[PDB]
Design an enzyme around this catalytic site. Structure first.
Site, PDB file in Angstrom:
ATOM      1  N   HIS B 132     -16.452  22.722  11.154  1.00 16.17           N
ATOM      2  CA  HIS B 132     -15.012  22.460  11.236  1.00 16.17           C
ATOM      3  C   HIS B 132     -14.649  21.002  10.995  1.00 16.17           C
ATOM      4  O   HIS B 132     -13.458  20.693  10.864  1.00 16.17           O
ATOM      5  CB  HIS B 132     -14.447  22.868  12.601  1.00 16.17           C
ATOM      6  CG  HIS B 132     -14.598  24.323  12.902  1.00 16.17           C
ATOM      7  ND1 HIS B 132     -13.981  25.305  12.155  1.00 16.17           N
ATOM      8  CD2 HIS B 132     -15.304  24.964  13.864  1.00 16.17           C
ATOM      9  CE1 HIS B 132     -14.299  26.490  12.652  1.00 16.17           C
ATOM     10  NE2 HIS B 132     -15.105  26.311  13.684  1.00 16.17           N
ATOM     11  N   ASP B 170     -21.107  31.871  10.703  1.00 13.39           N
ATOM     12  CA  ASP B 170     -20.377  31.641  11.947  1.00 13.39           C
ATOM     13  C   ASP B 170     -19.094  32.474  11.938  1.00 13.39           C
ATOM     14  O   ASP B 170     -18.487  32.670  10.886  1.00 13.39           O
ATOM     15  CB  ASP B 170     -20.073  30.139  12.056  1.00 13.39           C
ATOM     16  CG  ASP B 170     -19.483  29.738  13.408  1.00 13.39           C
ATOM     17  OD1 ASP B 170     -18.293  30.024  13.646  1.00 13.39           O
ATOM     18  OD2 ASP B 170     -20.208  29.126  14.212  1.00 13.39           O
ATOM     19  N   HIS B 172     -16.228  31.811  12.902  1.00  7.88           N
ATOM     20  CA  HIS B 172     -15.053  31.024  12.549  1.00  7.88           C
ATOM     21  C   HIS B 172     -15.160  30.504  11.121  1.00  7.88           C
ATOM     22  O   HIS B 172     -16.246  30.180  10.641  1.00  7.88           O
ATOM     23  CB  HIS B 172     -14.886  29.844  13.509  1.00  7.88           C
ATOM     24  CG  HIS B 172     -14.813  30.253  14.944  1.00  7.88           C
ATOM     25  ND1 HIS B 172     -15.913  30.257  15.778  1.00  7.88           N
ATOM     26  CD2 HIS B 172     -13.767  30.681  15.691  1.00  7.88           C
ATOM     27  CE1 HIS B 172     -15.546  30.676  16.978  1.00  7.88           C
ATOM     28  NE2 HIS B 172     -14.249  30.933  16.953  1.00  7.88           N
ATOM     29  N   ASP B 263     -21.985  33.269  16.720  1.00  7.69           N
ATOM     30  CA  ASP B 263     -20.896  33.739  17.555  1.00  7.69           C
ATOM     31  C   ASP B 263     -20.253  35.021  17.035  1.00  7.69           C
ATOM     32  O   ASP B 263     -19.335  35.530  17.685  1.00  7.69           O
ATOM     33  CB  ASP B 263     -19.825  32.642  17.787  1.00  7.69           C
ATOM     34  CG  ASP B 263     -19.515  31.788  16.566  1.00  7.69           C
ATOM     35  OD1 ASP B 263     -19.986  32.065  15.444  1.00  7.69           O
ATOM     36  OD2 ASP B 263     -18.761  30.801  16.756  1.00  7.69           O
ATOM     37  N   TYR B 303     -22.332  31.245  21.445  1.00  3.90           N
ATOM     38  CA  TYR B 303     -22.045  30.781  22.794  1.00  3.90           C
ATOM     39  C   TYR B 303     -22.561  31.701  23.889  1.00  3.90           C
ATOM     40  O   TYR B 303     -22.361  31.395  25.071  1.00  3.90           O
ATOM     41  CB  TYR B 303     -20.528  30.537  22.938  1.00  3.90           C
ATOM     42  CG  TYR B 303     -20.117  29.530  21.895  1.00  3.90           C
ATOM     43  CD1 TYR B 303     -20.547  28.218  21.995  1.00  3.90           C
ATOM     44  CD2 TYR B 303     -19.414  29.906  20.751  1.00  3.90           C
ATOM     45  CE1 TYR B 303     -20.248  27.286  21.023  1.00  3.90           C
ATOM     46  CE2 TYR B 303     -19.105  28.968  19.750  1.00  3.90           C
ATOM     47  CZ  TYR B 303     -19.529  27.658  19.908  1.00  3.90           C
ATOM     48  OH  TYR B 303     -19.265  26.690  18.974  1.00  3.90           O
TER      49      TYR B 303
HETATM   50  K     K Z   1     -17.787  31.493   8.750  1.00  2.70           K
HETATM   51 ZN    ZN Z   2     -17.833  29.464  15.565  1.00  2.00          ZN
END
Ligand code: K
Ligand code: ZN
Ligand code: K
Lengths: 8, 352
Positions: B132, B170, B172, B263, B303
């Site tokens: 990120h 991931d 996200h 995650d 996590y």
């Molecule tokens: K991703």
């Molecule tokens: Zn993530």
């Protein structure tokens, strides 16, 4: 808690 | 030979106000311990960690951003709180900058080990995460974009335009990785991520399937967003079958970097998905068919300590050459995959 990634 | 990098010093980055923040120091020590327990550690070549240099951080980040994070090394707690609060979802301690440097430098040494022929592939057990982080700002538990920096570092020791594939699984969207390479045809970014039409972090339409890249980079950004369903092995396997692997084969990367957050794993408190450790093993095994096996797996998020430890260990087992271990899709996952296929068929003949 207004933390974007935790949604808390 | 499979390489492995891990340094306990990356545990020093911590949240001094909230000891139960999910980006826990013991994320990496639990993964490392499970590699030892499963007798994977003794099968790997241990690659030493090192600090990234500020010159190396400037491959992707502004000097202002580097100097701000660096200055946090000397801040009192009140100023660490104030600085961290300027970003979206960041906590900072006096050790944070050093740990972020170690995470990046560890991945550079791993990429170097692959590209000099010391190992065929490698795994990097690092924190804080990276995907990120933007050119100019920290974001989403990330300070510097480790995977993006590693791609540029790889190019810096081989060919400026070396083709690098970054697969970001991931849960996200890696907003920072997408943005850093959005105009670049030398780095193919493929992200699978929960999206929920923008309700899921990082809460931006930048993560939707129609964001395909810009300029000479048009076609070299592939977003696979999930909506309206608890996705798992069937959906991720289908996305790899229909999208990730055909596009990657057509791109023909010389190095594969996995932004390997865990995650999306069954049990994760943030992701809400149910990819199994066997699922991640099959994803890894598929990626090993690319780039003559030159694959570097970089820890991002994840996590649930038990989930990430079993999942990443399964990935390393695949890198070591172990045999992969032994269902209809959610209908909205079919919709997502078809949306990406329609968006990217203009650019990739394998999708027509
Ligand atoms: K991703
Ligand atoms: Zn993530
Ligand atoms: K790109």
């Amino acid at each position: 808690x207004x933390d974007x990634x935790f949604x808390k | 030979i499979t390489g492995l990098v891990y340094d306990q010093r990356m545990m020093l980055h911590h949240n001094m106000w909230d000891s139960h923040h999910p980006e826990l120091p013991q994320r990496i020590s639990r993964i490392f311990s499970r590699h030892e327990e499963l007798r994977l550690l003794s099968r790997c070549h241990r690659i030493p960690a090192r600090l990234a240099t500020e010159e190396e951080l400037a491959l992707c980040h502004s000097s202002k951003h580097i100097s701000i994070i660096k200055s946090s090394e000397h801040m009192k707690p009140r100023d660490l709180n104030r600085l961290g609060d300027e970003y979206n979802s960041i906590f900072i301690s006096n050790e944070s900058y050093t740990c972020a440097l170690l995470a990046a430098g560890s991945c550079f040494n791993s990429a170097q080990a692959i590209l000099t022929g010391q190992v065929r592939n490698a795994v990097a057990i690092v924190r804080p995460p990276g995907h990120h982080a933007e050119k100019d700002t920290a974001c989403g538990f990330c300070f510097f974009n480790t995977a993006a920096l590693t791609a540029r570092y790889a190019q810096s020791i081989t060919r400026e335009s070396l083709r690098v594939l970054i697969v970001d699984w991931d849960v996200h969207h890696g907003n920072g990785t997408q943005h850093i390479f959005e105009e670049d045809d030398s780095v193919l970014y493929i992200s699978l991520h929960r999206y929920e039409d923008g309700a899921f972090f990082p809460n931006s339409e930048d993560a939707n399937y129609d964001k395909v890249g810009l300029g000479k980079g048009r076609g070299y950004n592939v977003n696979i967003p999930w909506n309206g369903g608890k996705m798992g092995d069937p959906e991720y396997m289908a996305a790899f079958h229909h999208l990730v692997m055909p596009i990657a084969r057509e791109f023909a990367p010389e190095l594969v970097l996995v932004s390997a957050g865990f995650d999306a794993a069954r049990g994760d408190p943030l992701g809400g998905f149910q990819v199994t450790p066997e699922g991640y093993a099959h994803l890894t095994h598929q990626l090993m068919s690319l780039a003559a096996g030159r694959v570097l797996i970089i820890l991002e998020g994840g996590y649930n300590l038990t989930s990430i430890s079993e999942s990443m260990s399964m990935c390393t087992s695949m890198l070591l050459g172990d045999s992969p271990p032994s269902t209809p899709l959610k209908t909205s996952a079919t919709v997502s995959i078809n949306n990406v296929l329609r968006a990217h068929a203009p650019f990739w003949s394998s999708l027509r």
